Design an enzyme around this catalytic site. Structure first.
Site, PDB file in Angstrom:
ATOM      1  N   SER A 167       6.453   4.157   3.929  1.00 27.45           N
ATOM      2  CA  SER A 167       5.538   3.864   2.824  1.00 27.45           C
ATOM      3  C   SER A 167       5.515   2.457   2.235  1.00 27.45           C
ATOM      4  O   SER A 167       4.606   2.134   1.474  1.00 27.45           O
ATOM      5  CB  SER A 167       5.730   4.868   1.692  1.00 27.45           C
ATOM      6  N   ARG A 187       5.001  -0.059  -6.725  1.00 28.54           N
ATOM      7  CA  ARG A 187       5.704   0.804  -7.686  1.00 28.54           C
ATOM      8  C   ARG A 187       6.478  -0.044  -8.689  1.00 28.54           C
ATOM      9  O   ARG A 187       6.855  -1.178  -8.402  1.00 28.54           O
ATOM     10  CB  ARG A 187       6.741   1.708  -7.002  1.00 28.54           C
TER      11      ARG A 187
END
Ligand SMILES: *C(=O)[C@@H](NC(=O)/C(=N\OC)c1csc(N)n1)[C@@H]1N=C(C(=O)O)C(=C)CS1
Length: 347
Positions: free
Chosen positions: A62, A285
């Site tokens: 990811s 993130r």
């Protein structure tokens, strides 16, 4: 302000603990504004016995989404893409709703069902089923579209790999080049990331790599070597290969403003709330550490590898930790601690 000194003993304890929990190997590299910290423990290949090292290459899973997001944001900078335009505008008849925008797909607010929930219900049987398969972007989107959306456009955060499969399709459509060419030209080459590759649908990892071991769902099951696969089920959502040094360079360059305009970087860091200590922007993130500092980057999970690649707000300190196993929540939670030691320092 200035960050505390990284805690190497704390980092050693974290690696040792992940090993006691099932990870064959584990390592971490800290690039602290010109002073390097490197530790590793365990094996890269549990069969032959080769030791893991911080120079070993691995699949970042990811984390690939940040690479994809960077390409799209550069496309915005060039005037080729508008974040608030409908995805259907650039790719006619793809999605069942015209109201879903590029910005929503990039921040996981689109409502698209994640097809991996169908593929990997059973971890090992799922990996065996897709490891040697080659999928087109359309194949994956169509798998997602067999299910309804999970929420109205932009209404809520729900992580979905589908979002970045759509991201890859967008990149190829707007540029007329494969995503490999785009990563190379806009990111790999300029940054001189010599351990970074996007070789889809190739199953080999070039050079010296850490093998990945998939933990089975049954307690006490024998580990499955999952190193070689096409990663075709992820592609622009998770097929990049890199190293600790390269991910440290990539995130330090991203955060210091060398990969796009300031206007787009601020867009990228427009946080949607995930939970109490985490946020998600555009393929990025945010994790809030205990000592009151926030780190930026991305995690990655792909069969056999757990990756954490984060950097400070200004890019001065970056960290990449890696354990060569997946489907082991104890190792996953433990490795997240490298972040506390690396950024927060000695307790
Ligand atoms: C990115 O790596 C992606 N991971 C997966 O699709 C997972 N399996 O791939 C084989 C996965 C999700 S959580 C887990 N134990 N395995 C997304 N990344 C994460 C992450 O852990 O960083 C997610 C929470 C959502 S799916």
């Amino acid at each position: 302000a200035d960050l505390p000194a990284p805690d190497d003993t704390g980092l050693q304890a974290v690696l040792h603990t992940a090993l006691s929990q099932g990870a064959p190997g584990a390592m971490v590299r800290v690039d602290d504004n010109g002073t390097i910290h490197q530790l590793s423990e365990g094996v890269a290949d549990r069969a032959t016995g080769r030791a893991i090292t911080t120079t070993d290459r691995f699949r970042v899973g990811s984390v690939t989404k940040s690479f994809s997001a960077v390409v799209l944001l550069q496309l915005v900078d060039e005037g080729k893409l508008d974040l608030d335009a409908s995805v259907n505008t650039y790719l006619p008849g793809l999605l069942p709703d015209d109201r879903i925008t590029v910005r929503q797909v990039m921040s996981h607010r689109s409502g698209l069902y994640d097809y991996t929930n169908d593929m990997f219900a059973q971890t090992v049987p799922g990996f065996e089923s897709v490891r040697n398969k080659v999928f087109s972007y359309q194949d994956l989107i169509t798998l997602s579209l067999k299910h309804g959306v999970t929420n109205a456009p932009g209404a809520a955060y729900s992580y979905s790999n589908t979002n970045f499969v759509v991201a890859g399709m967008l990149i190829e459509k707007l540029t007329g080049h494969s995503v490999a060419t785009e990563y190379q030209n806009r990111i790999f080459t300029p940054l001189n990331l010599t351990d970074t590759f996007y070789v889809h649908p190739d199953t080999v990892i070039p050079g010296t790599h850490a093998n990945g071991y998939l933990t089975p769902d049954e307690a006490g099951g024998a580990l499955v070597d999952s190193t070689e696969q096409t990663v075709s089920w992820a592609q622009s959502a998770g097929a990049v290969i890199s190293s600790t040094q390269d991910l440290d360079t990539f995130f330090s360059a991203l955060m210091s403003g060398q990969l796009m305009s300031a206007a787009q970087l601020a867009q990228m860091q427009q946080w949607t709330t995930v939970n109490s200590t985490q946020g998600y922007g555009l393929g990025l993130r945010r994790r809030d550490l205990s000592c009151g500092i926030s780190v930026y980057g991305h995690t990655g999970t792909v069969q056999g590898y757990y990756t954490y690649a984060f950097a400070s707000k200004d890019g001065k300190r970056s960290v990449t930790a890696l354990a060569n196993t997946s489907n082991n929540v104890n190792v996953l939670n433990t490795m997240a601690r490298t972040l506390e030691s690396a950024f927060c320092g000695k307790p």
